[model samples]
Target: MSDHDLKPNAATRDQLNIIVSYPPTKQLTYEEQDLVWKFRYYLTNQEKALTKFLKCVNWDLPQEAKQALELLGKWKPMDVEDSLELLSSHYTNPTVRRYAVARLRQADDEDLLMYLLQLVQALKYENFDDIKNGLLEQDLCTFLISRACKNSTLANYLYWYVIVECEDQDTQQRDPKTHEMYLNVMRRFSQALLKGDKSVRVMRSLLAAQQTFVDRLVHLMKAVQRESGNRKKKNERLQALLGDNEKMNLSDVELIPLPLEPQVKIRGIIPETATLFKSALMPAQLFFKTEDGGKYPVIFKHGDDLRQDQLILQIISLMDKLLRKENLDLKLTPYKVLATSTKHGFMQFIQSVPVAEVLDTEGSIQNFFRKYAPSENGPNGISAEVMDTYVKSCAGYCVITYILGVGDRHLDNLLLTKTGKLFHIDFGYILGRDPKPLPPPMKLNKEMVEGMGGTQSEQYQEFRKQCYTAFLHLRRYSNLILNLFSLMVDANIPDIALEPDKTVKKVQDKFRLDLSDEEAVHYMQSLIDESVHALF
Candidate 1:
């Protein structure tokens, strides 16, 4: 043991309990760390403190490592959430990662599918040499394979998910071990677990069908653009071309499994519902008919790299799941985004109007709500349920965007639905980059505050309450969020790739980890105050 690693003086159990009760968001003081270490063996049952204790340990020190590892071994199995957090880059020790993998066996396939994308990306963080058995023999691989063999939906996603990693040439060249690992898993998963040749043939056919559909749309859009002389009639011509079965060749082909919303069974295209925008990229909006008599509205864009948007949406979805798990549902509407290739992708289309347009037409956000969701008996001429939804969503987005450093906050990209759900789109700028001069820390514009019946109203007060609750709740998962960002440092996502070395720090800085819980709450309060009073 090192001479500098001294034990704390004899302390009462009550004093130690108080120290242990400190929130994970707080940075542990040296004295508290010493006391925790001194009583580590006695606190083996404090699973909540395990994460906090591990963070305090200097893993580089052999004595500290030995003690921490022993404690981890003695503790009972941890929650899947905690285990997932442990697998992040912050916990680099192979043993700790392996422990997390062992604990993940308890997660069901449905839950596994939700994180399938991140888990596949996490392969980059694993070292092949550390695996005594081949990578295919690892718990995560075996779990996926076993579950997939029985479930067709899981099988389809796992096949494409792993193949994407294998085919990314840049990732292959940069991390050969991970590339080789992905190749091995994909091969075994298709050949041994499923019908090798035919399974591949079907997957290929599905992909081809999707490509053909997009190819036809692009051709039709170009033809319409050339044939029409008037700009006003171009949209009508495009719609007519899309509607013709012969022009669109609209028919059912092999199902192209949607990696984003895997549970929904997509049958064929809804050609009549298709339309095109006027941008050079010619982004198309359409509805894909599902087997269950429903339409999945989506936008398909070509000539734009969607990997950055894909990453942002994935994190947003994960955050929504985390908040819901805590039973603190703020009505976060995270839509699906899947980048099939670098230049093309699909995103779920939520029917909503931009805040800018609402102001232009309806005068103010409150009046827009009054026009759409008017109620004679509720507060400010809006329905009680609608006002509640507006307040919660406002609070949710404010805290989430601030932590993500989502920038370029203009009224145009901020959207609102008839039901009063607020969401943001176009993640072209994130990690604190803003084109405008002096953007607010959070987008608490006078219009949004006014919609909540102003800063003094009950709804605005509820917005502040929910903001405090969400910020503190999310702080508990700070490690997981930080680690998720760390894993994406080499993902070539545009905003992250702009400054790869500082990416994780950019996210971590938002947590304000230096402050105690009470202090952090006050910090959030000040941010809200500043945002509301900031110049428009």
Candidate 2:
């Protein structure tokens, strides 16, 4: 070993101690670096204290800086309304401004919306430069941009100013207008957000989709509030009507409820009875063997990436409403989003497994369904569930995906249950955003039809009819759907972000909302035929 490396020589050791004892000799550009040094100086230990300051100013040492921040969290390591301390960080006191932004990002949905409106308008770019190629505080720019996308209002403004307006030098030449440097900062983030693919339409659609999504969530919460109010009165009436049993069977005893969602694992009896298989879908999962010997799989997702799960919930809810309105006896098992955060969410197990597993272990998706599809008088003839649950769900999803232009369909997200309910999951790509080249509008695969008994079976015909009817029912709500999407103008949904103005229009175009009912039907028929032909 070298003398300094193995056992530092007295000369080298003295030099090291002197270096550690002193802060940077050069003038620091950013005040955040100053704060880091100050924080470090207060702490003991020459090695770590110096590293904190090093990481803070020295971009090369990010790991050490990250570690320091984690350690700093123990103390109140960090907002503003000097009346002036507020607003797009036009305020002085860099230390406080950084902390303010950090706290703002941490705040829940409501507080985020109010402050965000001011932040965009507030940043006058007085301190910011607008050259052909220059990024301000690259680390903080990225850090803020990443945090900004999660908030609806913040995402919308950033998306529009950056992606929609094309503020970045990559697309537009020349400097940003003197006051618009805040936008350039967002543009940097917008570019970084793209894993690589920076297609315009892709960027616009996602940002436009944010508020549109949050609005739907608000409406959903309103409905739940009504449910909460109605429950107490309904319970009182139910007790008077039917003798109150200690254990009330939820579906049978209750009347006119939403689609069944498997309860959260911890709150339900499955925890006591069912053995869990933890090794499952990524982002983690839980599985419980139910009393009926069925599997209840719990899964979670963390990406507003494509607004996949949220859209699925809306489509399912809309279809269920349509079915109940038409008094149809069919429903797709809507996944229960027990608690939802924009980034993290929990969903009820849908009592189904991916069709891929069945095909791998036993047989094809169709054959597996044939083996398990429910029968009236034991497992004998065609399924009673063919029209009731299976067709309705398949038909609804087909129409839903086709209308929304949902993409990235494969064996993994296409799932089938033991009792013959079929559904789609993991809708990461949507509105014609297929990573693959020119996939069909919907995934009406061979196994899906085969599950109904064959290409020409009576059940298969019923499936087609349901698919058409669901399409028709969805039409009456096309305006509503379009309106919902219009709310997403300047949303953060990836595809929507790419083309904010055009996405809602594109979705409307898919519905052929301008077309006559007969014309819409013809268009849907053409899409169906194409989908079927591709599958066949």
Candidate 3:
């Protein structure tokens, strides 16, 4: 029979209709489809048949199996209570019971929470053979134990179950020793989660909760840091750290290191690096400072040494390293910068003093920008020259994407530093993985356009003129930037490896439609040219 001629089963049609209506795509495995069909058949025939069917299915399926079961569309919010009833009953499959319990725990409804607590209590003390058998063999008990220890709510319920509920049981009772072990496990898991563990196999529900906590804490810290009185404390701290030396030497730079240690160091300097910029600060030294005032030297590419696109790519890769560290360590310090001038121009500068002092309060790098660079009319704002320099400093991120071959340039990923510097973050959807077929041409955002003095204003025209002039600033250093990316690619970082393209063509093909290498390059170059002209 022709593929189109083969009819979909009635159950399959029902499943497909439900899945199609859902936002996410669904592709169930054969086994999953079978279980779904069985579920559908039983549910359609009689609601009373669900208990028997639930008992017949293997509950001890692996995580993959449990996921497949979920895909079967078995647990609806409406049917949650009925499902929980089966799950809590002695006759239900242990694996199904465990998964059901997990889902119910995630359901934010107070009723569900109360019911789950009761269910836990019931299972903990009940002497039914099925309940005992299921609890003994299934890993759900351990899973709950781990979750309870990590989360106060879960811990409270689990604690009640173990201590108060299970107190009467004699021989087959929940052992205090086992309960203690589970508690420890939960503590360890919670710590790991707090530390920003990114392992995929970890429970999503708990991870979501942990992430929410971290996000809230970050915002709270920012709020506290923004208090006007806090600024005095911050400045004092900075003054204390700057110490006796007005000029920071390599020693001072060493004393203050970047938050993240340098992983990919670019060697063999490219010449005419000073020429890459209108000013002299082509070669800049970046220092990362540790808490104890020890600075680690990091390489900062000269504008002349790398192209604008290349610089952006390098910065992104650097950011990736930093963020990955954050994910692993769950500890982060503000990234600091000290740009020194290499030439006679104001822009040509070097780190006379290390700027690695940690901010006194919890605030993001973005928060710093908002404070220092308050849009034109606001508080202690800097001069246009200072703003331009700061903006350019942050704009180095554009070069990052240019090198990475990323297309999208949204407002969310870019930031203006308090010092009037601009910075870009969030490279998750960048590089060749951009959803668009053709990258959009670069255009100044309203904020930037206004900052440069809006359309019909001389300042806007002057800004575009400066951008054109700076185009060469980035163009001169393109090679060095390319080399840096090549180094990163060669290192085969697991994250980078997740999105690999053998050639420019592969990159475009990965993002766009079928296109040859030459065609891809040609199209990209055209797009770049258009962006440059439009912006100018």
TM-score of 3: 0.29
Candidate 2 lDDT (Cα, whole model)?
0.50
Alpha-carbon shift of residue 284 in model 2 (angstroms):
3.4
Q: Point out the worst 10-residue segment of candidate 2 by lDDT.
A: 250-259
Q: How would the candidate models be sorted by TM-score, starting from the highest?
A: 1, 2, 3
Model 1 spans > 4 angstroms off: 1-40, 48-72, 89-95, 128-139, 150-157, 167-169, 172-180, 195-250, 254-256
- Over 1-536, each residue of candidate 2 has an lDDT whose tens digit, in order, gives 23112344576546445444332212244654554444453443332233334334443476754554444443333212111122222233343334445544545554343333234433442235422254413223444466554443355444433332332333234434632554566556656555434444344445434323333333322332333334444333333222222332211221111111322111122222222123322232334334444555655333322234554565566556666678764567666542233344446666678877878876875556556664556323536754356767777778777877888888878887777677777767777888799877667877677666666676666777777777777776654454345434443456777886577666766666567678777777777777777776
List the global CA lDDT of all models: 0.74, 0.50, 0.37
Tell me each candidate's TM-score. 0.81, 0.47, 0.29
lDDT score, candidate 1: 0.74
Error at 395, model 3, angstroms: 5.4
Rank list by lDDT: 1, 2, 3
lDDT of 1 at 324: 93
Per-residue lDDT tens digits for candidate 1, residues 202-289, read: 6545544555665675576567657645544665776676566654664454556555566776666675666666656667777887
Clash counts per candidate, in order, are 0, 29, 36
